[PDB]
Design a binder for this molecule. Structure first.
Ligand code: QPN
Ligand code: QPN
Ligand code: GSH
Ligand code: GSH
Ligand code: MG
Lengths: 199, 200
């Protein structure tokens, strides 16, 4: 049985998808959260110098979504058919591409607010509208059961709602989908028990 | 029977090229549909997420270049050998795609675009090259013991970067050897010869 150690900041951020997957599959792991001060010494040891990382039986994996896909392989979270797995991958990359546009590391707090604002004002509504149309009246984003794409939607939309509360005022179906993710017992339990962080 | 494949993108290597190498390598027939920057605005409003490339499979539309590449390579010799090696393949690909994605391809302000391209290539790119160099070490391929689509993606992304920064790999002969090996694979070599010659 694999020993798992997840390393990231004390933050939902890019690690959260992995956290939801372990919760859902009832897989025990070490949720190793590092204070900023412990980062330079860890970073120096990593091939690509980024987190999150996941150690599996003492072997290091990197890239949040690569890890997420590895953990869901051969499970019901992956997608039920090969083409469905493709749609799961595609939705995840669409969300990630958008989340990746935000200047998270930008030090000038004034340059940062100008950019976050432009993305949320002009770009975000187009995405939400595309996601809404894409979902239509279906139960989940892909197929007839929950996938890690639904989890990723709930996670990304939570972050976006921190900056733009009215993001989904015109998309009750997308709100419902968040609530469906949030009501899954293993996910709800995680949401109840996790550390409260802005991001 | 055999699925009908139609790829849509600009007349450009860009984000479609990984798909093109994969079809070439797997010897799969497809319609390589290339659109003009003038016909773009129209087609855009018809795509579920308004981005290219898209791949139509028997009339069903797929999107996201790397989602498509993973779909085409699943259960093939281009996927990683083990489930764990498949993770390494995906992680290298995302590392490369993350960096290429930092470039402001769509920036409407030329001066801003130029400034960020220069900064990415002067500061960020050399660090990524050293990381990749150390990662590859003296191994033949990036992951496992045979070529994967990660090696393909390296060659494609580095091709792009070399357009803007010709000296990028002067200090990395092992990364050059890998590109040369990808470029020498007969099906890839054949594609590189016959593809439309574009800047990017
Ligand atoms: C340390 C920088 C920081 O404050 N954050 C890191 C990035 C991030 C945060 C929240 N979501 N998120 C994220 C999730 C997925 C994809 C992505 F690009 C970004 C908060
Ligand atoms: C229309 C914008 C443009 O000039 N290009 C599109 C983006 C691009 C080009 C070349 N490589 N590339 C690319 C490849 C992979 C990942 C990625 F983010 C970007 C050229
Ligand atoms: N696409 C990657 C991005 C990883 C990334 O950029 N992570 C940040 C933390 S959110 C990091 O480690 N940055 C470098 C640093 O802070 O030293 C992933 O999803 O894992
Ligand atoms: N990560 C996506 C990016 C897709 C993307 O942004 N493609 C560009 C062209 S290279 C596009 O469609 N631009 C949107 C537009 O110009 O309207 C992928 O790899 O497919
Ligand atoms: Mg990506």
């Amino acid at each position: 049985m694999p020993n798992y150690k997840l390393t990231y900041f004390n933050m939902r951020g890019r690690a959260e998808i992995i956290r939801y997957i372990f919760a859902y599959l009832d897989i025990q792991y070490e949720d190793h959260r590092i204070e900023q001060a412990d980062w330079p010494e860890i970073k120096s040891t990593l091939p690509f110098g980024k987190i999150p990382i996941l150690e599996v039986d003492g072997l290091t994996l990197h890239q949040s979504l690569a890890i997420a896909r590895y953990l869901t392989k051969n499970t019901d979270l992956a997608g039920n058919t090969e083409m469905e797995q493709c749609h799961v991958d595609a939705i995840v990359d669409t969300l990630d591409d958008f989340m990746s546009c935000f200047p998270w590391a930008e030090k000038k707090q004034d340059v940062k607010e100008q950019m976050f604002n432009e993305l949320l004002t002009y770009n975000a509504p187009h995405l939400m509208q595309d996601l809404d149309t894409y979902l239509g009246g279906r139960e989940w984003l892909i197929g007839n059961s929950v996938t890690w794409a639904d989890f990723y939607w709930e996670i990304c939309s939570t972050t976006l709602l921190v900056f733009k509360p009215d993001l989904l005022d015109n998309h009750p179906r997308l709100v419902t989908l968040r609530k469906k993710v949030q009501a899954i017992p293993a996910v709800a339990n995680w949401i109840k028990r996790r550390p409260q962080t802005k991001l």
